[PDB]
Design an enzyme around this catalytic site. Structure first.
Site, mmCIF file in Angstrom:
data_model
loop_
_atom_site.group_PDB
_atom_site.id
_atom_site.type_symbol
_atom_site.label_atom_id
_atom_site.label_comp_id
_atom_site.label_asym_id
_atom_site.label_seq_id
_atom_site.Cartn_x
_atom_site.Cartn_y
_atom_site.Cartn_z
ATOM 1 N N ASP A 34 -3.711 2.917 2.746
ATOM 2 C CA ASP A 34 -5.063 3.168 3.230
ATOM 3 C C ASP A 34 -5.054 3.448 4.729
ATOM 4 O O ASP A 34 -5.778 4.336 5.206
ATOM 5 C CB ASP A 34 -5.943 1.982 2.883
ATOM 6 C CG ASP A 34 -6.377 2.008 1.429
ATOM 7 O OD1 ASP A 34 -6.808 3.077 0.951
ATOM 8 O OD2 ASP A 34 -6.142 0.996 0.738
ATOM 9 N N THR A 35 -4.211 2.725 5.485
ATOM 10 C CA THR A 35 -4.154 2.932 6.927
ATOM 11 C C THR A 35 -3.492 4.264 7.258
ATOM 12 O O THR A 35 -4.092 5.115 7.921
ATOM 13 C CB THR A 35 -3.413 1.783 7.600
ATOM 14 O OG1 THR A 35 -4.155 0.604 7.330
ATOM 15 C CG2 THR A 35 -3.358 2.001 9.133
ATOM 16 N N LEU B 297 -6.644 6.570 6.863
ATOM 17 C CA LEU B 297 -7.204 6.170 8.156
ATOM 18 C C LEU B 297 -8.404 5.242 7.975
ATOM 19 O O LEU B 297 -9.534 5.697 7.791
ATOM 20 C CB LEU B 297 -7.599 7.381 9.011
ATOM 21 C CG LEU B 297 -6.560 8.504 9.158
ATOM 22 C CD1 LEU B 297 -7.055 9.539 10.190
ATOM 23 C CD2 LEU B 297 -5.150 7.998 9.505
ATOM 24 N N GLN C 72 -11.961 5.467 10.072
ATOM 25 C CA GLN C 72 -13.035 6.443 9.908
ATOM 26 C C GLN C 72 -13.959 6.104 8.749
ATOM 27 O O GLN C 72 -15.032 6.693 8.656
ATOM 28 C CB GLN C 72 -12.489 7.857 9.738
ATOM 29 C CG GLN C 72 -11.772 8.138 8.463
ATOM 30 C CD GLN C 72 -11.269 9.581 8.414
ATOM 31 O OE1 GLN C 72 -11.699 10.437 9.197
ATOM 32 N NE2 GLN C 72 -10.275 9.820 7.579
ATOM 33 N N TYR D 45 -12.066 0.518 -3.225
ATOM 34 C CA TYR D 45 -11.793 -0.728 -2.534
ATOM 35 C C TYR D 45 -12.541 -0.852 -1.215
ATOM 36 O O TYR D 45 -12.842 0.076 -0.461
ATOM 37 C CB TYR D 45 -10.278 -0.913 -2.280
ATOM 38 C CG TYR D 45 -9.643 -1.645 -3.420
ATOM 39 C CD1 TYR D 45 -8.502 -1.188 -4.107
ATOM 40 C CD2 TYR D 45 -10.220 -2.832 -3.851
ATOM 41 C CE1 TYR D 45 -7.958 -1.940 -5.183
ATOM 42 C CE2 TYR D 45 -9.709 -3.598 -4.912
ATOM 43 C CZ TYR D 45 -8.555 -3.143 -5.560
ATOM 44 O OH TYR D 45 -8.056 -3.894 -6.616
ATOM 45 N N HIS E 87 -1.141 -4.801 -9.347
ATOM 46 C CA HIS E 87 -0.889 -4.108 -8.086
ATOM 47 C C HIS E 87 -0.783 -5.167 -6.991
ATOM 48 O O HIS E 87 -1.050 -6.340 -7.218
ATOM 49 C CB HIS E 87 -2.008 -3.113 -7.749
ATOM 50 C CG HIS E 87 -3.351 -3.768 -7.670
ATOM 51 N ND1 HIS E 87 -4.063 -4.133 -8.795
ATOM 52 C CD2 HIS E 87 -4.079 -4.188 -6.606
ATOM 53 C CE1 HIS E 87 -5.173 -4.752 -8.428
ATOM 54 N NE2 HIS E 87 -5.215 -4.781 -7.103
HETATM 55 N N1 LIG Z 1 -7.862 3.821 -1.313
HETATM 56 C C1 LIG Z 1 -7.375 5.180 -1.330
HETATM 57 C C2 LIG Z 1 -7.340 5.704 -2.776
HETATM 58 C C3 LIG Z 1 -8.681 6.271 -3.268
HETATM 59 C C4 LIG Z 1 -9.405 7.187 -2.517
HETATM 60 C C5 LIG Z 1 -10.621 7.678 -3.005
HETATM 61 C C6 LIG Z 1 -11.106 7.273 -4.245
HETATM 62 C C7 LIG Z 1 -10.379 6.347 -4.981
HETATM 63 C C8 LIG Z 1 -9.177 5.850 -4.495
HETATM 64 CU CU LIG Z 2 -6.425 -5.882 -5.969
#
Ligand SMILES: [NH3+]CCc1ccccc1
Ligand SMILES: [Cu+2]
Ligand SMILES: [NH3+]CCc1ccccc1
Ligand SMILES: [Cu+2]
Ligand code: NA
Ligand code: NA
EC number: 1.4.3.21
Lengths: 620, 620
Positions: free
Chosen positions: A290-291, A295, A298, A374, A423
């Protein structure tokens, strides 16, 4: 006037103009990352130069660029063309989220898959998922996203309740081509909705909760000056914000009498990764950073008073760049407040007759980000007693699949037909240490058990041992909860009144690290996540444990590359990298929206002060 | 009308009269323990019988007695004479605290030791420390306390700053004889004071803390009925109080729709032990069981509003017996209040457009005890989401020694000449489980790593395994942080809507267990502390992990005796015993009064509910 001040809207508008004038921001360009650079070591010459780093993507297939610009001097410092097959693709753009669904919506293979399942294409949402690096040679040098489908029954429906399993597509988002559509079989689309605002699901709402009112009638105890400089109960620091990392803490220091004593030069969460443990080909490639890939800064939320932050809240509204260089304010993106924290110290003495009680409190700096399903809150805490703590709060909706008839060893069932693959959520904290200055060292501390025998005749003794980490090749460490293992960061050249080196002790939660096979693609790309603690020698360009360009990079960049330099770390300018995470076997209670779970770490003073630093706290 | 109601002053006065009339409370008698007995299993016949258990000491050397009396029927049920060489001595009496100092103050060997160190005997305090069982055959069957000396410079001085090292005495408190005085050498008495209310030490007090006001303008959300029955946010329970254990929680249950669902029948901290790791003969015998030897409930503090408990506080004032059978109120001994606990659940959805945030809160039940130098707070937390958490907060003054010239492997230096021996604080939680009723079982859950290969071609899969504990001989378990080990308590006969057994997962902190050599006296007397988790079959008389009479018992009683019965625990009425603790290497910041450190455990629902149980929480 502070070099650590937040970026202003005007600074970003100047950057846009510099880029435009230089021919670097044409209509096919998009800014994929923009952030201020920290001052270099030895900038104490008092010559401010506000420099910005920019990643520029080209939607027409030309090579992206890395650009550094000085807004102080209105010039482009350097501009490098990137070979992405070599160094990695640029981070995912927000405007690419929709492109995967729209490209698939006209693909005959995709339409054929949906028609066999009787799904109206206008109801099918497609998650834009990072691709990683696997066996597909045609993907090297290409900007690929993979798509997994979810059905929305109506526009306010929670699509996560309706995964379309047995189907995945790969898309090249620059050339606008669907490279592969894989259909391994039809699974029933789970039927129950997961609409957690539906009165039919929630039932009548509770009437029993009475209000808790938290107020500060004389205002908060902390001051904010220069936009982002905090003073609170002897602590001093600057709150920064970066579109990749989110909240960054600079210049954490503690005023001990007359001296301002440094503790941490820079603290950030420098990477996070969510690897999935489902061996189905539909999902076995799924790991998002995610980072580094998306990013997290944002996607910071605007935080609402009384709902997200309760009490007497001071807000910061950081400014970032949109894809065209325009400044974009994140209104109320950072919450700052102090919190009562129970008893600090207490004793009633049988011999002196003195009864003594003091209250604790903590300073909270927090932000919340949302990336797809998430949602994460990042919390930094400063306590009266010198403790520093980080806490990640994970919530949002779990990523779902079908639950296979006859069960699964790698997916849990949440509802009829509905599964949630196993996960992990793994974080890397980067702590640029500065314990009483920059000459620091790390010791590993283990409890030592002793055997009954001479000198220990009753078999009660136990001790501890400390091992100094002297070079980078020996500074990759594992947890050992059974031996109470911790790590002490000390300054061998700064002593307390007992002539012992001053220090801080890192207490980890000792959760499992990366579970994937060491030969897997993710174990190579997320090598930091395989060990609990790494120590490097500080260097300006060693910013992220995974490297600068995580998206589709083939592996090995970042920490394993840095530590091969085998630099001296014994009483030097060092950086501690701590891996910590949650292993998530989803439970029924996680559905349809997940109660917060937490993980983190803390640092506590270890002979840093000459006695308790909270003797001067008053009695309320 | 509830059988679980707190003991009343009138009940204790009735007990005293019954004892007196029966000839069991003559002038040489002292009550060393008095407590209400829980109702037996199958008391659902609706025949209330309030029974009390009493330990009676004889100050003239006659044999103590164990007595059970019914206040319902005004009769003595049983009265047993105890052979203390066999079954253990009775708990320490509060009135014996002073007897050790006064007996030594006329002993010629003691006076000779103090005179050589130029100490005025009127300034010398003597800690009354439990003796344990070591090599001294003359102590079997005798009531022994050991004494360590501290100097008070003036009546308000903190004596802990001035230990008298190299000196210990053993005293028989019934025959009023000093059995041994050991003087191994003169150590300088540390000179600095540790008076943490002295302006000369604290400096000027801070002026920077502004008030935090926590109020509930419409009152608290919980109700208290029948004196001690709590209802709060679907939770139901009874708060009990025992002079040995302190706060005890009965009948913890959760109202899920229409059903009241049991979770825990009885929860308590059933023992705690502080072993010291200093091999000096002056201290190598030192291990105190604050619960079993001293009784933590009789030292509960009176908690002050705004200082100890902040917010809208409801108090309970439990009643205990003094040494003569008179009722003694502990005014404001238990604090009860609810606390905001941040974000409960949050998600902003990119496809539905719904933004959702809910706040968490917790119910806090707490008490604070002081036994000599140490002070402990015991906190039980109930959360909206079904989580149950216990937290111990340790503070007070560390137990001190001289710091030897040339250092120590088992003592840390806190001030010039002043040391603090290494030690642990180890707790045993006794959880009489009742997950949806009494047919429960325990599974151990480990993460399972999988190798790259067929069926796991990308090397990303991981799983979990659960092992049912079927008999007591296999239900003594160790932690394994590296494999994410947890324990699930389930009901195999009660299924959720997915047809999975309902359950709760115990999450431990995975701190080190007992460090002493397995052949030591303390490893035998505190056998529970050598393993993280024990499961027994419920039995009325198996109350404490160390047995009923801990003081001077030679070892092996309690848990290792219980589990040798090898009873069936697979879908039966079971009790979980969880060991958890802190290993304390004292730091300079712990001196002269110690900031709180914490340890604990939590239980979280694991498929107990059919979906998140907090969908009906409103939006504030
Ligand atoms: N967290 C990044 C993966 C993601 C990005 C957009 C929709 C679902 C999952
Ligand atoms: Cu989880
Ligand atoms: N905590 C029990 C040991 C103890 C009791 C009284 C004074 C000092 C120490
Ligand atoms: Cu301690
Ligand atoms: Na550093
Ligand atoms: Na039970």
């Amino acid at each position: 006037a502070s070099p650590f001040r937040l970026a202003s809207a005007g600074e970003i508008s100047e950057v846009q103009g510099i880029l435009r004038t230089a021919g670097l921001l044409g209509p096919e360009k998009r800014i994929a990352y923009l952030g201020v650079l920290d001052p270099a070591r030895g900038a104490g010459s008092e010559a401010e130069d506000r420099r910005f780093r920019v990643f520029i993507h080209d939607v027409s297939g030309a090579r992206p660029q890395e650009v550094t610009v000085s807004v102080t001097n209105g010039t482009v410092i350097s501009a490098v063309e990137l070979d992405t097959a070599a160094t990695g693709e640029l981070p995912v753009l927000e405007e690419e989220f929709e492109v995967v669904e729209q490209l698939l919506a006209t693909d005959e293979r995709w339409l054929k898959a949906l028609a066999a399942r009787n799904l109206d294409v206008s109801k099918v949402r497609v998650a834009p998922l990072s691709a990683g690096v696997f066996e597909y040679a045609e993907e090297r040098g290409r900007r690929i996203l993979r798509g997994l489908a979810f059905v929305q029954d109506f526009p306010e429906d929670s699509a996560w309740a309706h995964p379309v399993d047995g189907l995945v597509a790969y898309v090249d988002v620059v050339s606008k081509e669907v490279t592969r559509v894989i259909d391994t079989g039809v699974f029933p689309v789970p039927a129950e909705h997961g609409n957690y605002t539906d009165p039919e699901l929630t039932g009548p709402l509770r009437t029993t909760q009475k209000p808790i009112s938290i107020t500060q009638p004389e205002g908060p105890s902390f001051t904010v000056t220069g936009g982002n400089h905090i003073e609170w109960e002897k602590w001093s620091l600057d709150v920064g914000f970066d579109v990749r990392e989110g909240v960054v803490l600079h210049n954490i220091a503690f005023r001990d009498g007359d001296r301002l004593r440094p503790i941490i030069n820079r603290a950030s969460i420098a990477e996070m990764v969510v690897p999935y443990g489902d061996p189905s080909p539909i999902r076995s490639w799924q790991n998002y950073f995610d980072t580094g890939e998306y990013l997290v800064g944002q996607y910071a939320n605007s935080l609402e008073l009384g709902c997200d932050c309760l009490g007497d809240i001071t807000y910061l509204s950081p400014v970032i760049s949109d894809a065209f260089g325009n400044p974009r304010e994140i209104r109320n993106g950072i919450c700052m407040h102090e919190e009562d924290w129970g008893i600090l110290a207490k004793h009633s003495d049988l011999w002196s007759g003195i009864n003594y009680t003091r209250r604790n409190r903590r300073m909270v700096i927090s932000f919340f980000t949302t990336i797809g399903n998430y949602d994460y809150g990042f919390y930094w805490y400063l306590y009266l007693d010198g403790t520093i703590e980080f806490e990640a709060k994970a919530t949002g909706v779990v990523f779902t699949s079908a639950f296979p008839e006859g069960g699964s060893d790698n997916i849990s069932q949440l509802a009829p037909g509905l599964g949630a693959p196993f996960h992990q959520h793994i974080f890397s904290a980067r702590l640029d240490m500065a314990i009483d200055g920059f000459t620091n060292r790390v010791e590993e501390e283990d409890v030592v058990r002793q055997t009954m025998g001479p000198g220990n005749e009753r078999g009660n003794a136990f001790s501890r041992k400390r091992t100094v980490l002297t070079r980078e090749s020996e500074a990759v460490r594992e947890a050992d909860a059974r031996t109470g293992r911790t790590w002490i960061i000390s300054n061998p050249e700064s002593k307390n009144r007992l002539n012992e080196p001053v220090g801080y002790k890192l207490h980890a939660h000792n959760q499992p690290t990366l579970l994937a096979d060491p030969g897997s693609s993710i174990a190579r790309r997320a090598a930091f996540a395989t060990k609990d603690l790494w120590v490097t020698r500080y260097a300006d360009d060693e910013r992220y444990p995974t490297g600068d360009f995580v998206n589709q990079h083939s592996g090995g960049a970042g920490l394993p590359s840095y530590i091969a330099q085998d630099r001296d770390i014994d009483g030097q300018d060092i950086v501690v990298w701590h891996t910590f995470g949650l292993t998530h076997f989803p439970r029924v209670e996680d559905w349809p929206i997940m109660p917060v779970d937490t993980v983190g770490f803390k640092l506590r003073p270890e002979g840093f002060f000459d006695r308790s630093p909270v003797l001067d706290v008053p009695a309320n």
